[PDB]
Amino acid sequence: SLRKLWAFTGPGFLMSIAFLDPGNIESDLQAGAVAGFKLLWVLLWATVLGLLCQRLAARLGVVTGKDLGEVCHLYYPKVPRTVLWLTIELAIVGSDMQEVIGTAIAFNLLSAGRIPLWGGVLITIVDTFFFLFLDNYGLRKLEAFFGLLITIMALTFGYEYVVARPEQGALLRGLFLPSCPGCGHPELLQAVGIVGAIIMPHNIYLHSALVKSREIDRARRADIREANMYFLIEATIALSVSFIINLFVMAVFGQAFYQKTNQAAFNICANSSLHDYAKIFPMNNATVAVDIYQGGVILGCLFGPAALYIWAIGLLAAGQSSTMTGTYAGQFVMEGFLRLRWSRFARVLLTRSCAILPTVLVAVFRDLRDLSGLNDLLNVLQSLLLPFAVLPILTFTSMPTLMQEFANGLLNKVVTSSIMVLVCAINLYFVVSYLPSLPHPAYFGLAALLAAAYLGLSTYLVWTCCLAH
């Protein structure tokens, strides 16, 4: 019925908001800038795998009555839960750095260069603890508020895409054909980055926590099956919305960015009066390395400054939404792995601090290209940390002790094993690419130790899963 779906509605907008974090925005920015339409099939495969993973998360959370954090606390011994919890902590703080840089760039774009970066970060942390102050008369649930916000930003991106008017002929091969002849290693780097960024590792915990919101009676199996199917339908709808918005941004950015040289863009939109044109043109015909600031200024110079202001508004909305979803996710990590049970205080304090330090340092002593590189490294780190969040769920839905009936079938088991070996191989190849890239020989030992710890934790989790397999 429509009323039952309306009652079950509310989470899907939340995971979609998490999917539309500013880190995803920068990642698809760079992907469209460099490879263009050749990586859309990567986006499709990553999105469908994320949908499968969140289906598993919703299934586990609804059926067991507790989030995945509680079950890993119940199962694993002390040291593995501690290490894994620090893993989600690192992933979530990386996401926080992503969204704070996004908000800072958006505020820079609103100010038209008048307000510097430190002003942006201070005002966004002020707004964050203003949201904390909102507890004065807090009776809110955020679902309608942030559905309105996501619809707003979706309408902005859709209007930008439609006024761009792309042609779907190339989109056919981009979406359908799973290959990329003629591209190179940076294309692989951005593909891995988009794969990691589209599937936020913390979203598994986030959904496994929000499942409790609806009243589920675990005694009756038909009711929990209906709840699971409703949650799957809602997740499918949310993922479809996320993918269509990503399709819009992919098409427009690939059409407006591919084989575009710096001096050509400068000549095209030098008749206008942005006054930000200085950075774009180093008087050479080469690929235009573009961040959110440069992307917005280029869109405004090609189509009109309205494009820029609305783009920055969408970026600010995405940053606020991602900040909120990170706060909720991290609170649930606290209650799952330590049962610390705070109310939005300690998590937000630690996250905003661990974000403000590096970004304030990079704003004081580095330029915006360093910010773009830092976000690249952040979303690469998110990709590297993804298996540490996709394997525990695989294990915990593997064994039948929690789910005698609602276990994993043979087809799901083998498919999930295939994806887990695929992602582990991807991480191995990426770290192999990273090994010869160290400028200083002193980092060899640190990189080797970090890789050894990563492989050891991965092999321990694989041993646990094969025991559960």
Numbering used by the authors: 54 to 522
Q: Which passages does the manuscript contain on this structure?
A:
Iron and manganese are essential nutrients whose transport across membranes is catalyzed by members of the SLC11 family. In humans, this protein family contains two paralogs, the ubiquitously expressed DMT1, which is involved in the uptake and distribution of Fe2+ and Mn2+, and NRAMP1, which participates in the resistance against infections and nutrient recycling. We show that both proteins catalyze selective metal ion transport coupled to the symport of H+, but additionally also mediate uncoupled H+ flux. Their structures, while sharing general properties with known prokaryotic homologs, display distinct features that lead to stronger transition metal ion selectivity.
As in case of NRAMP1 the low yield of the protein in detergent solution has complicated sybody selection, we have attempted structure determination of this paralog without fiducial markers by combining 57’783 micrographs from five datasets. These data have allowed us to identify two distinct conformations of the transporter in the same sample. One structure reconstructed at a nominal resolution of 3.9 Å is equivalent to the conformation observed for DMT1, as illustrated in the RMSD of 0.5 Å obtained from a superposition of Cα-atoms. Whereas one of the structures obtained for NRAMP1 (NRAMP1occ) closely resembles the occluded conformation obtained for its paralog DMT1, a second population of particles reside in a distinct conformation that is distinguished by an outward movement of α-helix 1a and concomitant changes of α4 and 5 leading to the dissociation of tight contacts between α1a, α5 and α8 and the consequent opening of an intracellular aqueous path towards the binding site. The correspondence of equivalent structures of the two human SLC11 paralogs to an occluded state is illustrated by the inaccessibility of the region harboring the conserved ion binding site from either side of the membrane. With respect to their conformations, the two human paralogs presumably display intermediates on the transport cycle, which in case of the occluded structures of DMT1 and NRAMP1 would be placed between outward-open and inward-occluded conformations found in the prokaryotic transporter DraNRAMP, where the intracellular gate precluding access to the metal binding site has closed while the extracellular gate has not yet opened.
